[PDB]
Amino acid sequence: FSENITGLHLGKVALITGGSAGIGGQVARLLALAGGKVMMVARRESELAVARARIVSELEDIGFAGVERRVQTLANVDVSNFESLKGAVDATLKAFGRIDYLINNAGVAGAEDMVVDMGVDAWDYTLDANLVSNYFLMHHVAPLMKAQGSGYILNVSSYFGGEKYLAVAYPNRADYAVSKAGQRAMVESMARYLGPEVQFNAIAPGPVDGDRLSGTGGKPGLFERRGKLILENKRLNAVHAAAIKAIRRGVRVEAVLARLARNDTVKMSHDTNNPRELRELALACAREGDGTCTWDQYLLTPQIAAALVSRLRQAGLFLDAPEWSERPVTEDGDWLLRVPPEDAPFLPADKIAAEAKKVGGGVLSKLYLGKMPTEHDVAQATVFFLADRAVSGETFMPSGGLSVERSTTERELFGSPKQERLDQMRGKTVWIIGEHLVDYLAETARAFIEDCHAANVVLITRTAEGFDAVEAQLDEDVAQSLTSLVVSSDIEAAMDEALSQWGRPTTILSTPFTALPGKLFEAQDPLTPDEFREVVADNLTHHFRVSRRASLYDDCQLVLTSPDVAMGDKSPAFALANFIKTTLHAFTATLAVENERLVHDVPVNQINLTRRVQSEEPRDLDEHLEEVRRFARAVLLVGAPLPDAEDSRYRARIYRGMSMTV
Amino acid sequence: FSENITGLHLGKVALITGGSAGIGGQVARLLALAGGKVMMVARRESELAVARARIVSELEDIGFAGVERRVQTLANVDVSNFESLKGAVDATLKAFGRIDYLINNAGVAGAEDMVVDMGVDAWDYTLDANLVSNYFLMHHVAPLMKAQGSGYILNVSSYFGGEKYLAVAYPNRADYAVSKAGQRAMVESMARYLGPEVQFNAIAPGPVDGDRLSGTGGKPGLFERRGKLILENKRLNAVHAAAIKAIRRGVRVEAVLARLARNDTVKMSHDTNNPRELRELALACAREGDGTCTWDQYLLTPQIAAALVSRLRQAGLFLDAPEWSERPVTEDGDWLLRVPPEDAPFLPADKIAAEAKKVGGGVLSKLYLGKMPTEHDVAQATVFFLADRAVSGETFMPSGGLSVERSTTERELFGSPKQERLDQMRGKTVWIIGEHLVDYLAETARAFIEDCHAANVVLITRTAEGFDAVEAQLDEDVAQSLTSLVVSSDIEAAMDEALSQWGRPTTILSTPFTALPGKLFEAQDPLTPDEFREVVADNLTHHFRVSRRASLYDDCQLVLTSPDVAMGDKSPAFALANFIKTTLHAFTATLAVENERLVHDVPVNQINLTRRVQSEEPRDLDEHLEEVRRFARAVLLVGAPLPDAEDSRYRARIYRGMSMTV
Ligand SMILES: CC(C)(COP(=O)(O)OP(=O)(O)OC[C@H]1O[C@@H](n2cnc3c(N)ncnc32)[C@H](O)[C@@H]1OP(=O)(O)O)[C@@H](O)C(=O)NCCC(=O)NCCS
Ligand SMILES: CC(C)(COP(=O)(O)OP(=O)(O)OC[C@H]1O[C@@H](n2cnc3c(N)ncnc32)[C@H](O)[C@@H]1OP(=O)(O)O)[C@@H](O)C(=O)NCCC(=O)NCCS
User: Fold this and answer.
1) Looking at the DSSP assignment, which residues form a beta bridge with residue B12?
2) SS3 A152
3) How far apart are CA A508 and CA B271, in angstroms?
4) Which residues span the domain enclosing B629?
5) Which residue among A427, A563, B67, B245 is least packed, with the fewest CB closer than 10 Å?
6) Residues of chain A contacting B396 with CB distance shorter than 8 Å
7) A603 contacts A595 by C-beta, under 8 angstroms
8) Alpha helices in A195-252 (DSSP H)
9) Which residues are NADP(+) 2-binding (chains A, B) (predicted)?
10) How many Å apart are CA A472 and CA A438, to the nearest integer?
11) How far apart are CA B520 and CA B602, in angstroms?
């Protein structure tokens, strides 16, 4: 095979990110064997130098001439850094005089945390490295490819980023899932604008057999790594649930934490004065050991104990607690009165291996082709797809026929709930976060106040002017139930302040503060990489930042809104709204599954203010007013306290992680 | 070196149907150049020998050896002749000792009629040639491939068979669209069973630039062919519409037909004897001429006149017409008093060109890559895709980035309508067609009688026992409004009989008479091609045969039901149900668009009794009875008199062509 494809890509120039190892290294190799010129770029110079050296030796053996000039490298290329990526483009053009293929292969695993534990810096890094980087490179290379009359951009997404019309939950990996869904969503929504010269496709392999998946150089396998992650999160969630259950029935949080601080399972189960939830917690922990590990004798490690106090703090559970209300956040690891010894594992290796085989067996059992593709198999597929000249706007699936069955599909709304469900809002507080969507914010506030008899709507805006514009659309009697909170630092701080001032909300509606830009690849005024980064911040990160507080609130429902497009607009805003709809759906689906594993059990659903077909968008005022009213009905449908469809498996499923378009 | 891509397919054996010309011919050539062995099969020896000679000549020129033996042919292989297909498998095994790739490429254009004008034989011819032929070959080659441990089956579908989760209307081509959708639906639903050994994928190009599309030797181009067909259907629909509107006002059908028989636009314009509808029709036809063609002087050709009286008859509008009901059907073309002269064209060449330019310009404008792919481009893509070993169950799109925007996604029910709307059923007649789905048929009859106050439910069954079983589930007071009609010849005759006896239905629910088989590719007891043909007859053709009558009934709503799977079943019945759901959705979407062009304006919607996710299927008695109740609610939602497009453009579109799963 590898010596007999010299004609497939002869003379084509490829820039491949993350080209030192894995799929990227194999694509670099096979493109060179197929007669292409390759600029391989990566962070690590040693891996890159060895990989290129091996390719050049193979090129010599199959009798290429001038092999050194055919494969070039650029090290210390960090995809999270724009200057560093620009150097990769400049190096490719300096070496080869053009770029034919851009392979957006580089990726990071990301935070590997539940959303409620995930840092904003970790989320931002995953989105910058995996998704914004790809737009940065497209921005710089697309004009070169259009000017020469041809090009190919390929995004290396993942099967776990979902597929068109069908989101997939990726618990503990929401930042990664969003970044991968985003790579694909760019192909679906932007290929129109890269044509006619540039083909723009994605690949979405699932698990891929090679050194990184198997584990090499004394490193655990990716199934083993998720197994360990799963047990840590099960212990955190279990300790957290016991603390919350105790606080709900009126145990002081200071008393719960003083009892957990003793961090002794045998003493905790036996002690009579410990709350039943802590006794039962400690009993269950004491049964989980193997004779080596320590998680049967200690409830908590410093790291899990830090994650626990963070969740309690962010739920507002320290607001009236003398000590904790004021303790430095820097000290969240340091409150245990004894900690597991460092000479022994916390977690049992047997349960790690068992969870890893649940993970591996689960994916391996859903492969139509019976075995995981290797990195070479996925690289071979990639090099074959790159030779096609007729496909654009598609995601190829070189996954081994991976089929994970799920019903998380975007729905058009035409349905309603009983007034009895709405009556449960009477006397409650709701938060609406927004700025630019005045008609939608106003009608939703009116529906909650006038139709559902909510006592207080807290409208959390970017500016006082944004508050006044919504208030000006309400009757005076309705407006007396509208409270203003203008963001002063960040949305999480504004949410902490709203909770402190007016209490626990029953419904949170998250809308973007800013309208989408009306531009993408136009030569006159394109959407710059910094502008695209802000679109991601305002339309994805924003919802994450709201969600990571909202998911900690008992009896609260969370509603995420994707973008609107002004009536009559004919710009790429409509493509950008559909990009966000797809990418945010990965988040919604993932968060809905995580939240069911938390004691707070917060439902999350998504409402879309843009339809899939631009001719079906509202085109006159009657259709606009129809959409505004439908939007408020959709918010009440997924925002009102969820019905007793705990009886029905079917109905329970259709109020968590839905994406509904109005 | 320049041209060497042998590593892709060296020694792989392909059987290619329609292998002498078009895409099939180019796939045979490129597989051979890539080191493959090919058995090219088609009807004409002469065309096969030219294709084979050209390939053999080119191989020789690229320096291949033993080249005669690498490229073989079999003539008289016709996809409508299943014995000739078996002969093609045998010839491949005789020549090469094995089969690696099956390329299901041969196909026919089909009836090129609106559903209400299409014959059952023409429909059956299309489905047998384009869909059942593919299953026939799959049935014979799959065991060979599984035994050797590897294989690839590639179905050549069409963009206009839709894509996963998104159906597409192909007006005038419902037979073809269903066949193409079926080729893709087999890949989506059956790949699991062809694995792990066999990859099973489709391609779905749209228009392909070559001899067939352009036209050769005085044969019209495909765009020109659709243009003429559009003018013929617009003339038939306009004459039909005027006739129906006159009959609705109470003009006797015999009087309308006596006036139309005169077939003189200028006299019909002016004569005060004529109904206003015929005067307006004649005036409109009179204005459409070009000084050469005759359709401005005659309303009808014999062929259009035959299609007109067939529609009136099938609507039951001759039941009380003495001359017309008795006329033999063979004289449907003989009733005009004058006919256009045979030396001059009926249709104007210029309007055919204008329509052809609307058709061609439409799809060309939706290509992201700007240019229609050539036959060579699509074959090259196919040969690249066939080298991949990681993809199964997917449809590749080598279409030039063809993007036709539509909102036809399969939806899962959580929607409702006003009791006022259900109340318009009061006093009306409903038809329920079915046999095996007793619980669903009973609850739907009960819902129509008890909840909507329908006067009469005509339950059209295969057997008396099928009726008795539904009747036995009803309270005696509800059962008073249930009428039996047992099919004695065909469903069309039973519908004619129900119409004659009990009058025009407001709602027609079509359900399949037979349960799906519980088998597919099992070595012990596979689904034979003849059994698969009966699945098609019972689950696709059955609905077509109901629809071609129902689509002619004023103020009627048509509901098509796709298959159920018995609770606890773990057979490929589930895969077969999902195959039918996808394939029938092509029919539903296409017929909804055609029917809006007809004067009867009959809405068509589809209800699915099987879910996409097998673990979501009802798993106890309680979930069964919830699904049964939800089914009847879904039939009422799409079966009761619908919301006017004038009230809402958004709502109007939801209730035409939908596929809803309960
Ligand atoms: C498909 C998949 C995403 C589903 O994730 P999931 O729903 O979390 O299920 P997992 O297999 O991870 O879950 C194993 C167990 O851990 C639990 N679990 C996982 N995350 C948890 C959390 N944060 N808190 C509590 N329990 C958790 C699950 O609930 C399940 O518990 P159960 O067996 O006791 O019911 C997951 O199995 C997976 O990661 N598969 C491999 C993906 C892959 O191959 N990707 C390669 C590209 S990056
Ligand atoms: C895309 C497509 C399927 C849409 O079909 P469509 O909705 O019937 O639209 P068409 O372009 O055929 O319609 C042209 C006109 O004829 C009308 N028309 C078509 N069939 C009709 C019928 N049976 N009765 C009445 N009017 C009809 C349309 O409504 C339209 O009228 P308008 O300009 O007044 O709106 C069609 O345009 C088409 O065949 N395109 C080419 C597909 C192709 O490339 N094929 C590849 C090989 S399979």
Assistant:
1) none
2) strand
3) 70
4) 405-662
5) A427
6) 391, 394, 396
7) yes
8) 211-214, 222-248
9) 18, 20-21, 23, 43-44, 78-79, 105, 176, 180, 208, 212
10) 10
11) 36
